[PDB]
Design a protein around this ligand. Structure first.
Ligand SMILES: CCCCCCCCCCCC[N+](C)(C)[O-]
Ligand SMILES: CCCCCCCCCCCC[N+](C)(C)[O-]
Ligand SMILES: CCCCCCCCCCCC[N+](C)(C)[O-]
Ligand SMILES: CCCCCCCCCCCC[N+](C)(C)[O-]
Ligand SMILES: CCCCCCCCCCCC[N+](C)(C)[O-]
Ligand SMILES: CCCCCCCCCCCC[N+](C)(C)[O-]
Ligand SMILES: CCCCCCCCCCCC[N+](C)(C)[O-]
Ligand SMILES: CCCCCCCCCCCC[N+](C)(C)[O-]
Ligand SMILES: CCCCCCCCCCCC[N+](C)(C)[O-]
Ligand SMILES: CCCCCCCCCCCC[N+](C)(C)[O-]
Ligand SMILES: CCCCCCCCCCCC[N+](C)(C)[O-]
Ligand SMILES: CCCCCCCCCCCC[N+](C)(C)[O-]
Ligand SMILES: CCCCCCCCCCCC[N+](C)(C)[O-]
Ligand SMILES: CCCCCCCCCCCC[N+](C)(C)[O-]
Ligand SMILES: CCCCCCCCCCCC[N+](C)(C)[O-]
Ligand SMILES: CCCCCCCCCCCC[N+](C)(C)[O-]
Ligand SMILES: CCCCCCCCCCCC[N+](C)(C)[O-]
Length: 661
């Protein structure tokens, strides 16, 4: 009886995902614990087409987030549109989307929704890698208290401090329709590397007010605060002598974020839905970093404010149903970056009293409009769509006295198609216009070369999704042509060079109840995820034909979950093939360990859990192991100051505990 869907991202509803006309995968809170995951990257890695490397480089710590979709640069997760309840996670979404500080915590989430395709009309910028949305925990309908903790230790490491991650959820909704939940997640500890001591506190207050069935108010307040020493890379000599050690004693990172979001929804009936969301974030991200014969201090402050009204209405035009969606977003971001320094040869770290060699302020004003129409005709659901962004950015350098500006547009036409083969089998196809912005650090290059145009991509997908209850599976193909990237893929970046890469491949995953084969295998489920990704450099120049760095051609997971009675036994494997560390695709390792082929690996993990009388207090206990066979592997940071070899996580033991009242 015609019901407007409106926001198909939202809380990542199972049905919106199944009906999604493009590659989209969700992993819900229920499945976070099965592999001992406590971080965003550990869950993101179980998703096909997503590669989330272990901490390294600038992001050599837990406050940062590193991931790339389909072979796009994973460093600091800058090629996908990253959101939390639809709100921009980057402290500078447009001009500096690098998540050197990623103020989100797995502990505060009900799900992770990776929309690799079909979201380029409704979300931006940096939409080439699709959209990744972190869904915060729901406010309990009636009072609820949940708490959990996981402790980890790497026995073969010299690092004896453990890493502890905890989460707390307390909330409910009064009979008057007002509900709120306090969501707290914290991390304390070190990983398998020396000099990784970390503290993260992520406190959120989520509220909802629905005085009636027509008006609904929502809010999200967050105070995120953390600090972390950064292990950094080792030269090959140092790594062979002791791979746990750190030779970057001054490297440390810290930051804090304050966020306020307020939204309102007006739904008169089931065919019309108006939504307006407003937000403001303030972020400070800073840290010490050894650079040559100096140690620097880099405080960067950011302010982002946005307002986004959206409207959806569904009506019939003959036999076909048309759900028209229109939206607008005004976003303003402002920045201030400084860099103080001292000579390393001295004692003392740099401070506010040290001289400084950087003082810049940047900002962007962005107007985004979008219009789509989801047309249901017979077994078809066709959604033509169009996004248009007008972007104005500037960079003001207080030391050089330069003031540069760019004004540009991003027209992004799209068409996605869903075809219902059966009530449990869909087919989809699509094409979308995607884009990367002219980042603040590229404004100089953009004005100098005379060309100010966005980084443009055109994507195509074809795939199918299936779910008959005993078997869930999907398989899709994708093609991405990403042009005019301000970051050239040549060995030597020049003012006029523009990067150009092509990403093609196959993504798939499936889960099957073996109990359908024999009761001997009751409660035994087997699954696997896999993606073949071929990310190539197609920029004419000295790297034409080479492979994009940090993009394994093969990557996935396989596992078996066995749940007799109240027990849960998990077995899982993560595997990926090799990768290059640089655009030149150098095979042989450099002595400083920053470049050279990075071998693939296949790890195994397992866990045993027990849910004590689901009643009483829903106590869940678990003991698990990551990398059971202590398979050695490593990754490299190539370009950052803490470049080098980073040991991969060795055999790691963990215990989990959770309570629910
Ligand atoms: C079954 C184990 C239940 C323990 C889960 C406890 C998580 C609550 C952690 C809150 C820690 C707060 N803080 C900042 C004071 O440390
Ligand atoms: C500058 C470091 C000072 C830390 C400020 C971080 C806020 C602490 C929030 C902890 C919330 C604890 N809890 C369980 C009571 O909600
Ligand atoms: C910045 C976005 C937050 C918007 C808050 C504005 C709400 C406007 C709607 C008024 C609601 C009126 N009422 C009584 C009928 O519910
Ligand atoms: C004054 C309360 C501060 C809370 C901010 C709440 C989020 C609403 C966002 C305001 C956006 C304003 N505008 C027009 C400048 O974009
Ligand atoms: C250049 C700054 C102007 C940005 C402020 C934009 C105000 C948008 C407010 C939402 C209006 C929604 N609508 C459809 C109901 O009119
Ligand atoms: C119902 C969602 C559509 C929102 C329409 C809201 C109108 C806001 C337009 C103000 C933008 C003005 N301008 C020229 C500066 O971009
Ligand atoms: C019932 C008609 C209302 C449908 C609105 C359709 C909006 C889709 C617009 C796509 C146009 C794309 N472009 C650039 C190629 O013109
Ligand atoms: C006044 C023309 C009536 C046709 C309505 C169709 C929307 C116009 C958009 C098509 C323009 C496409 N483009 C890129 C080639 O300019
Ligand atoms: C009024 C036409 C509406 C069609 C929906 C737009 C489909 C986007 C197709 C763009 C394909 C562009 N090209 C040249 C790169 O192939
Ligand atoms: C016998 C009448 C039923 C029509 C047969 C249509 C099924 C062919 C599948 C078309 C699905 C196309 N695609 C790529 C857009 O999903
Ligand atoms: C392995 C790649 C296959 C991906 C599926 C995409 C097929 C759609 C073909 C349209 C692509 C057109 N072209 C020339 C613009 O790339
Ligand atoms: C145009 C030929 C280049 C294709 C290179 C072939 C490697 C892709 C093969 C992996 C297929 C995996 N599987 C099971 C999901 O089908
Ligand atoms: C022969 C004993 C009859 C009991 C049937 C139990 C078979 C369960 C075997 C699958 C165990 C999987 N794993 C790795 C999760 O432990
Ligand atoms: C109700 C008990 C059912 C008896 C089946 C017993 C087989 C337990 C399998 C051990 C799984 C061990 N692990 C960690 C390797 O997965
Ligand atoms: C005293 C007999 C009661 C039978 C209940 C079976 C004992 C449950 C075992 C808890 C094991 C918990 N875990 C995950 C830490 O291994
Ligand atoms: C609707 C009935 C709710 C029962 C209230 C039960 C209160 C138990 C709360 C203890 C929370 C303990 N802690 C530290 C682990 O968070
Ligand atoms: C149904 C009995 C009502 C009593 C439950 C209310 C008392 C809540 C006690 C939780 C206190 C937790 N702690 C450690 C944080 O203090």
């Amino acid at each position: 009886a015609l019901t407007v869907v409106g926001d198909w991202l939202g809380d990542a509803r199972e049905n919106d995902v199944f009906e999604h006309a493009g590659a989209r995968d969700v992993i819900r809170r229920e499945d976070f614990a099965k592999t001992g995951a406590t971080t965003m990257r550990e869950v993101l890695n179980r998703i096909p087409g997503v590669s989330a490397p272990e901490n390294n480089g600038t992001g050599s710590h837990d406050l940062a987030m590193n991931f790339g979709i389909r072979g796009l640069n994973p460093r600091l997760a800058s090629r996908s549109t990253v959101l939390m309840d639809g709100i921009p996670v980057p402290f500078a979404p447009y001009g500096q989307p690098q998540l050197s500080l990623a103020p989100v915590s797995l502990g505060n989430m009900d799900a992770i929704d990776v929309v690799r395709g079909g979201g380029a009309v409704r979300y931006g910028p940096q939409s080439v890698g699709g959209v990744v949305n972190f869904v915060t925990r729901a406010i309990p309908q009636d009072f609820g208290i949940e708490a959990g903790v996981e402790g980890q230790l790497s026995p073969t490491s010299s690092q004896n401090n453990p890493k502890e991650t905890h989460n707390l959820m307390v909330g409910g909704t009064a009979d008057n329709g007002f509900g709120t939940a306090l969501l707290y997640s914290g991390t304390r500890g070190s990983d398998w590397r020396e000099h990784s001591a970390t503290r993260i506190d992520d406190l959120m207050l989520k509220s909802k007010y629905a005085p009636d069935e027509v008006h609904t108010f929502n809010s999200l307040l967050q105070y995120y605060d953390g600090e972390a020493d950064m292990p950094g890379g080792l030269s090959r000599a140092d790594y062979d002598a002791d791979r746990w050690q750190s030779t970057r004693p001054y490297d440390r990172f810290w930051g804090r974020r304050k966020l306020a979001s307020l939204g309102y929804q007006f739904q008169p009936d089931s065919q019309h839905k108006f939504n307006i969301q407003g937000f403001y974030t303030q972020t400070l991200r800073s840290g010490y970093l050894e650079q040559g014969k100096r140690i620097t201090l880099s405080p960067r402050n950011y302010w982002v404010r946005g307002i986004e009204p959206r409207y959806s209405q569904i009506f019939m035009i003959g036999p076909s149903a048309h759900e028209v969606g229109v939206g607008y977003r005004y976003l303003n971001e402002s920045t201030h970056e400084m860099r103080y320094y001292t000579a390393t040869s001295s004692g003392q770290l740099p401070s506010g009293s040290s001289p400084y060699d950087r003082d810049t302020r940047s900002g962007t004003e962005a107007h985004a409009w979008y219009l789509d129409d989801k047309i249901d005709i017979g077994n078809w659901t066709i959604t033509p769509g169009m996004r248009f962004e007008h972007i104005e950015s500037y960079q003001n350098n207080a030391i050089t006295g330069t003031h540069e500006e760019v004004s540009y547009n991003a027209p992004l036409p799209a068409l996605n198609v869903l075809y219902h083969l059966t009530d449990s089998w869909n087919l989809y196809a699509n094409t979308e216009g995607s884009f990367g912005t002219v980042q603040y650090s590229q404004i100089g290059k953009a004005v100098q070369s005379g060309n100010v145009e966005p980084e443009k991509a055109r994507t195509w997908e074809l795939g199918t999704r299936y779910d008959d209850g005993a078997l869930t599976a999907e398989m899709g193909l994708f093609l991405i042509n990403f042009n005019n990237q301000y970051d050239s893929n040549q060995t030597n970046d020049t003012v006029t060079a523009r990067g150009k890469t092509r990403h093609t491949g196959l993504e798939t995953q499936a889960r099957y109840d073996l109990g359908t084969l024999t009761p001997t295998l009751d409660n035994v489920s087997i699954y696997a995820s896999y993606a073949y990704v071929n990310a190539e450099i197609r920029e004419k120049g000295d790297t034409y034909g080479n492979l994009v760095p940090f993009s394994p051609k093969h990557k996935g997971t396989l596992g078996v979950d066995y749940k007799p009675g109240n027990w849960t036994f998990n077995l899982n494997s993560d595997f990926q093939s090799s990768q290059f560390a640089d655009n030149a695709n150098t095979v042989k390792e450099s002595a400083d360990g920053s470049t050279g082929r990075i071998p693939g690996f296949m790890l195994w993990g397992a866990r045993v859990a027990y849910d004590f009388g689901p009643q009483m207090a829903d106590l869940n206990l678990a003991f698990g192991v990551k990398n059971i066979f202590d398979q050695d592997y490593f990754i490299r940071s190539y370009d950052d100051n803490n470049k080098g070899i980073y040991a991969g996580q060795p055999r790691t033991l963990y215990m989990q505990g959770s309570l629910k009242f």
